[PDB]
Amino acid sequence: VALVYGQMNEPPGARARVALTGLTVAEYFRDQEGQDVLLFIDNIFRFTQAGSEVSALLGRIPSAVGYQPTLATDMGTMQERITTTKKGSITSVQAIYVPADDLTDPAPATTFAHLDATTVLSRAIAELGIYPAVDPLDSTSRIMDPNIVGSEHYDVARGVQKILQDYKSLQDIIAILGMDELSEEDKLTVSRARKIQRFLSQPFQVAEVFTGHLGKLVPLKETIKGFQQILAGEFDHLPEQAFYMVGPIEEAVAKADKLAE
Amino acid sequence: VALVYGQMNEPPGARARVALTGLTVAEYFRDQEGQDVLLFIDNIFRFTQAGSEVSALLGRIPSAVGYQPTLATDMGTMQERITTTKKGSITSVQAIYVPADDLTDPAPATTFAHLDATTVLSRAIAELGIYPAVDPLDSTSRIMDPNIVGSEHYDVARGVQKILQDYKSLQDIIAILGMDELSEEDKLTVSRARKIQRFLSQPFQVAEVFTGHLGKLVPLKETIKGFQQILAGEFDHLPEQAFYMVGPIEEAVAKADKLAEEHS
Amino acid sequence: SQQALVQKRHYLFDVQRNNIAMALEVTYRERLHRVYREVKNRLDYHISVQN
Amino acid sequence: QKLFVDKIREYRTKRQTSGGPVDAGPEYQQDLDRELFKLKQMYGKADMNTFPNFTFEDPKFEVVEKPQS
Amino acid sequence: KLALKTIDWVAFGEIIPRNQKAVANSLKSWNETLTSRLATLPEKPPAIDW
Amino acid sequence: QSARMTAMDNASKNASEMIDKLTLTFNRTRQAVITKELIEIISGAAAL
Amino acid sequence: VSSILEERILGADTSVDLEETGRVLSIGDGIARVHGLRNVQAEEMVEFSSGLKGMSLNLEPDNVGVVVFGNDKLIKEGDIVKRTGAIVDVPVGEELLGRVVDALGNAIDGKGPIGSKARRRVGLKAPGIIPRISVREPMQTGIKAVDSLVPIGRGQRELIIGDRQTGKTSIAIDTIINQKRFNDGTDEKKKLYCIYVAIGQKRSTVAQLVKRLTDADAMKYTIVVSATASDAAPLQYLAPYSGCSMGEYFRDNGKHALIIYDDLSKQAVAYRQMSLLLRRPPGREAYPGDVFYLHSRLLERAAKMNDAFGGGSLTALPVIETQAGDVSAYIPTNVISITDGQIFLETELFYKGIRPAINVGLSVSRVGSAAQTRAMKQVAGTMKLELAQYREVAAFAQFGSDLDAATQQLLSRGVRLTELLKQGQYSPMAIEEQVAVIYAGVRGYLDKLEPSKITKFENAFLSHVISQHQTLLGKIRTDGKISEEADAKLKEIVTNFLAGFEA
Numbered sequence A: 001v002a003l004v005y006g007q008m009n010e011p012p013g014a015r016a017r018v019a020l021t022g023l024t025v026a027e028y029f030r031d032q033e034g035q036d037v038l039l040f041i042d043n044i045f046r047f048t049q050a051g052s053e054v055s056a057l058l059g060r061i062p063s064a065v066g067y068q069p070t071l072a073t074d075m076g077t078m079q080e081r082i083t084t085t086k087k088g089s090i091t092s093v094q095a096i097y098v099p100a101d102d103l104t105d106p107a108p109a110t111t112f113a114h115l116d117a118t119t120v121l122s123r124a125i126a127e128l129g130i131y132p133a134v135d136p137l138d139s140t141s142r143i144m145d146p147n148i149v150g151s152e153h154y155d156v157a158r159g160v161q162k163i164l165q166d167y168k169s170l171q172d173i174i175a176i177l178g179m180d181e182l183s184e185e186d187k188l189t190v191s192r193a194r195k196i197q198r199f200l201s202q203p204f205q206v207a208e209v210f211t212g213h214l215g216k217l218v219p220l221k222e223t224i225k226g227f228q229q230i231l232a233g234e235f236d237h238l239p240e241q242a243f244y245m246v247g248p249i250e251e252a253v254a255k256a257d258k259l260a261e
Numbered sequence B: 001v002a003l004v005y006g007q008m009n010e011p012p013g014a015r016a017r018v019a020l021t022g023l024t025v026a027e028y029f030r031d032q033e034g035q036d037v038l039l040f041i042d043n044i045f046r047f048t049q050a051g052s053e054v055s056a057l058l059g060r061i062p063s064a065v066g067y068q069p070t071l072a073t074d075m076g077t078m079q080e081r082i083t084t085t086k087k088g089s090i091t092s093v094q095a096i097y098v099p100a101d102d103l104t105d106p107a108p109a110t111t112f113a114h115l116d117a118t119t120v121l122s123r124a125i126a127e128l129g130i131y132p133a134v135d136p137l138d139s140t141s142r143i144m145d146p147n148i149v150g151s152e153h154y155d156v157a158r159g160v161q162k163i164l165q166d167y168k169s170l171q172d173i174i175a176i177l178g179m180d181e182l183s184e185e186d187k188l189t190v191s192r193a194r195k196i197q198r199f200l201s202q203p204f205q206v207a208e209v210f211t212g213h214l215g216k217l218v219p220l221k222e223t224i225k226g227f228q229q230i231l232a233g234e235f236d237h238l239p240e241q242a243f244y245m246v247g248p249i250e251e252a253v254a255k256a257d258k259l260a261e262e263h264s
Numbered sequence C: 001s002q003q004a005l006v007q008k009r010h011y012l013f014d015v016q017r018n019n020i021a022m023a024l025e026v027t028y029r030e031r032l033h034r035v036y037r038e039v040k041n042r043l044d045y046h047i048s049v050q051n
Numbered sequence D: 001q002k003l004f005v006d007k008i009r010e011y012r013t014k015r016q017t018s019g020g021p022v023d024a025g026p027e028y029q030q031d032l033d034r035e036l037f038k039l040k041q042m043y044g045k046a047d048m049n050t051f052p053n054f055t056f057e058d059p060k061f062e063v064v065e066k067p068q069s
Numbered sequence E: 001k002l003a004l005k006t007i008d009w010v011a012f013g014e015i016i017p018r019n020q021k022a023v024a025n026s027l028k029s030w031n032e033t034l035t036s037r038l039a040t041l042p043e044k045p046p047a048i049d050w
Numbered sequence F: 001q002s003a004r005m006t007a008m009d010n011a012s013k014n015a016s017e018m019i020d021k022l023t024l025t026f027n028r029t030r031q032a033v034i035t036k037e038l039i040e041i042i043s044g045a046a047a048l
Numbered sequence G: 001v002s003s004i005l006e007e008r009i010l011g012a013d014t015s016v017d018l019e020e021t022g023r024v025l026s027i028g029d030g031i032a033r034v035h036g037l038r039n040v041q042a043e044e045m046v047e048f049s050s051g052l053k054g055m056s057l058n059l060e061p062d063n064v065g066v067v068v069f070g071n072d073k074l075i076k077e078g079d080i081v082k083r084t085g086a087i088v089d090v091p092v093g094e095e096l097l098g099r100v101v102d103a104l105g106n107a108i109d110g111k112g113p114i115g116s117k118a119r120r121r122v123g124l125k126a127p128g129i130i131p132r133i134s135v136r137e138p139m140q141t142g143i144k145a146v147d148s149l150v151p152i153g154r155g156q157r158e159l160i161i162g163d164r165q166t167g168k169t170s171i172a173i174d175t176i177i178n179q180k181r182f183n184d185g186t187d188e189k190k191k192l193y194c195i196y197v198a199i200g201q202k203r204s205t206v207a208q209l210v211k212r213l214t215d216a217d218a219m220k221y222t223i224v225v226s227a228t229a230s231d232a233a234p235l236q237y238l239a240p241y242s243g244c245s246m247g248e249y250f251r252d253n254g255k256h257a258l259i260i261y262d263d264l265s266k267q268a269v270a271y272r273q274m275s276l277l278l279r280r281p282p283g284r285e286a287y288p289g290d291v292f293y294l295h296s297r298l299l300e301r302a303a304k305m306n307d308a309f310g311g312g313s314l315t316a317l318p319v320i321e322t323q324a325g326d327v328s329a330y331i332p333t334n335v336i337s338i339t340d341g342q343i344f345l346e347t348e349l350f351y352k353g354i355r356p357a358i359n360v361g362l363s364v365s366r367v368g369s370a371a372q373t374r375a376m377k378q379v380a381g382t383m384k385l386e387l388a389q390y391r392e393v394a395a396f397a398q399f400g401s402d403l404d405a406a407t408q409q410l411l412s413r414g415v416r417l418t419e420l421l422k423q424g425q426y427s428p429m430a431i432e433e434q435v436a437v438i439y440a441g442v443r444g445y446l447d448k449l450e451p452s453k454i455t456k457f458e459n460a461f462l463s464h465v466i467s468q469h470q471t472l473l474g475k476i477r478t479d480g481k482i483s484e485e486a487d488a489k490l491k492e493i494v495t496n497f498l499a500g501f502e503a
Ligand SMILES: Nc1ncnc2c1ncn2[C@@H]1O[C@H](COP(=O)(O)OP(=O)(O)O)[C@@H](O)[C@H]1O
Pocket: B140, B141, B142, B144, B145, G163, G164, G165, G166, G167, G168, G169, G170, G171, G321, G355, G356, G357, G423, G424, G425, G426
């Protein structure tokens, strides 16, 4: 790993162009090294903050919300330099700040326009308690198509998204009267969707100090089988806390046995 | 009492220098006479607004909402001269207009920063009919401290504010659904809250033309005793109409008895 | 059991005894702290007047 | 060494003018009296010599009694 | 100059009549407050230097 | 069922009234946000 | 008299020397366009002939914008402006302790001059990734809520964000008043030198603040630095950099120091005044561009130093107010983005009844369990997870959605821990009593006990444990972890006290 690090307390010429330094190093590891290389840019919103600060001072008219007029063009240059080419393969994970959970800020919107597979990390599901408070109902994928990944994976993913999106309007039905009048099947799908949403949480190995749990690794086929087994109706009787901080479905079985007896 | 008047007919340079005039009069009466002066400055937003008008003419770059960049420090110097010192005492009551009921406007915000006792004389509580419509939640004082005002006054005050905050959450629920969704605990909180919120209102001496009542001067211990009885819940049978424009709590008991007798 | 309660009858009176002893010792220590406070006040007043 | 030695000389001339604070005027003593008056406020009406100790109080805890145990 | 004998305060509850239970509560809470008032005070300040 | 129909009629009416009031304050807040952002952009381009 | 004479006539050198100057153009509103200084360096302390400093910014080919340190009546058009010759600097020592110091170095409190020794440049560069090491020490505040949900690290920055009049300065002074028991103790690692930079406040609030700290005997950690409202906008601008430079002196000597930046939004608005008077283009809410760079320098001057660089730490905690709780404003988004720890007060819990009014799930400490003691880590993680469960179940079951035994268990334990986290003003407690009382709250023994009775439970429980359990608390705080014999002993003492509480 090659580290390029510009601190957060440097003048904006040193906090915008340091992302470009990471791009240059990872381009050399992709251009003429001939190697599969991956680049982790955390956190490209200091780039846009730095551009807005110099554009305040350079003598350019402020654009929309207060950023530079050259936002989309400058970030288009520094996000189209970072893509895989025919010479080498480079994959770029980008930690991208949004200000106070405002996705309609133009710099996160144009950043959405540059990606391939985003992942929203909301806060509200951590007010719930799921960590990281990941929104997949706002997440995207170019990779998710029935020929690319499969039909089984695609259908269980769209089933999870369908039952979590229905749980929102159904929960707003709950919020006035309660769990009394929904239906048999309506209360059943509310509890099933809540059980899935608790099953989305997963203990990270690097975060064994925030929750204390050791943290596990889950392969892809196990995730497909676990969510297909929750949608298939196998686990309608286990409580919601049995699925909370688990890895595979066997860990949920073991935690249910620990809570019960 | 000395009087200085720079009223609203004046050009902005004049109104930007009236608080300075009355303040250096009262600052003479503090320093070189040693008296315990009162300083009644109405309405310090006119000072700040005259500053903004002049500064729009002075060619300075406009700051936030439409004011001057020197809103913090011009008002800073003018408010730091209004202070109680070793040489004498100033008790300065000052009325501070808010533009279009915005407390997030820069001049009321910095004036919240420069004060020792705020009182948010709101309007919505006058839509409800309570005069003065003092929002008491957003009104605080620096002196409320159990090592100063005593434990009894502090417990009664924080209980009153607790009951009114619970009433604000419950009036959200009431405004949607209605009062037939609350439990016994919630309804006793709502009833005690409406009783307290009517009992905060009193008739003043100067506003006897608008209302009908004479001027009620309520002592301190009767305020503590009345709100302590209403908070402890000894008045779960009087109507809330009996606590409106009352004063002392014996006047509330007498108004309820006279209401029952005129219904008799 | 009433025999057992008969045996324990030297606890209440001990609580009154050490209550009175602690109250009197606290009162004498308050005498000490108080005269320290006023002579402190005299000397600090003279020092502030000189300053 | 031009000016400051002249200032030294005037420090001598103000220093030689002892027997009270120099050329004071009445408002000097008035400011003394107001500062001394606030200093009278910060302790009360005590004396500058022969300090008092306290007023002898008496802790009186009432005797607990019982009819019968 | 204190002579203290601490008891476990269970037999203090087992020992009282119904007639003086409220006064025993008052004496117990007052003794708790007075022990805390003892505990808040250190023994003496140093002598005033001259 | 009669009193529940009455209570839900009155709650729908109160909710519709509060939707109307909150739509009015949403619109005035929207206009204030547009005017604020506009004054910031115009102040920047003028102080340039 | 004679000593005053000789110090006056020997101290001033009157050593005249040829010196760069320049006459003054427009002296507008604390800004002065100065023509002539063709060798002035950017952001330099320069000196107006009436005896008053200014700071040279905005070097342009026409003229230099010097912004004055104080009053504006004392400057005309056409007077000299002498270069001092160095960047603006703060006199720092350990004899500066316990003395209110006006923002440059000038101790305006009436207790003589400052006995400084170590002058320090105020605009210094913060340490890099190698001189820093991570948070290790548990920076305790005495607040139960802070030390049990958002604990601070000696080595860390953590906001106190809220709206006006919520208890943020009171949380900062609880944090100050806690650390007396670590100063007067034995370990140098525990001892505290703190710097309270009061930006843009009023002088009587700083005066009553010094009254509370002197009455609480705080004046050996504390260094109060007041840049009040009547002070000029560069004194309010430059004051937290001065407190940071004093904290950097203590840190680079190897003493654990902290800085409370009270009302940091006043620095932001004073720098807005400065930029709009020096005619820089305005950005958002008329704040210029580099306000984030301003607070980013100011707040990344603090993390734990390496073991080969003394081992001294700095704890930056800046206090910031929003308006109407709008976290999305420019200065709160910038200052949340630079910091990592942040304590959120919403205010509706202040009027609802919990004190200090941390409304909570918005507040987070990224260093987490690493900045706790071992006992508080062993006790208070399940408390945070339970409060998360309680908040979400009360939020959807506001009306009684479904009440099984589990939901009433969640609401019972949640309400009881909510009344655990209440705490009076200016009463900080040590870590061992916090471990004892959150042990009495989380590990059973309080779940069915009438939630109005929690406060008297607190008072009588602390009286019990301070009455005959001082050596056991010494075992808890000195052994680190709460041992298993101490665990079952706390179980027995809380059971005995549950009997004495239903006695
Ligand atoms: N733990 C507490 N118990 C009781 N009151 C508190 C507590 N913490 C804060 N307060 C209240 O907060 C107020 C002070 O708020 P402050 O910290 O000055 O906010 P700001 O600095 O924004 O004005 C005081 O009136 C005090 O009563």
